[PDB]
Structure 1
Amino acid sequence: GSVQIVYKPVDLSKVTSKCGSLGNIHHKPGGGQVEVKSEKLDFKDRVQSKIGSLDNITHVPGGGNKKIETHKLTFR
């Protein structure tokens, strides 16, 4: 009845970027407006919410590479 699991990934990989220069970036969005109305809010178990927002983002990561590697075993 003897069961053997040997698990040996060999990951010689690479993720790479070369950029000569990251240039001139302008983020100039106009004046946004947000309006939200209720009489009641009533939240129970494990709710998560964003109920009125205005979000301006410039990321410009300079080589934002990702090597996301979520991984698992399980048994019986």
Structure 2
Amino acid sequence: GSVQIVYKPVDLSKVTSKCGSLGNIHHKPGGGQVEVKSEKLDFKDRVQSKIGSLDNITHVPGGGNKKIETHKLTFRE
């Protein structure tokens, strides 16, 4: 028996944006306090931990448009 696989996806997707003006943004955090106590930490695989954190992010992209596109073809015999 013959097996024929044709995988032909066609993509014409426009993920666009327009913005006439993008301004006047004031991010003014007022401090804070974080206290973390631990004794034993054992991270043994794909760990992405984040302990004892006080972060401030001002993220102003003029765009920021995202496009994630995954293609998987799994052939087994």
- TM-score, normalised by the number of residues in structure 1: 0.85
1:6-65 C-alpha deviation (Å, 9 max, x unpaired): 111111111110100112101001111100113443444554422211111011111100
Bigger shift: residues 39-48 or 55-64: 39-48
Secondary structure of 1:49's aligned partner: coil
* Identity level (%): 100
Distance 1:70 1:56 in 2: 32
Unaligned runs of 5+ in 1: none
Q: What are the ranges of 5 or more consecutive residues in structure 2 without an aligned counterpart?
A: none
Aligned residues: 76
TM-score after normalising by structure 2: 0.84
| Cα separation, partners in 2 of 1:10 and 1:35, compared to 1, 3 Å | same
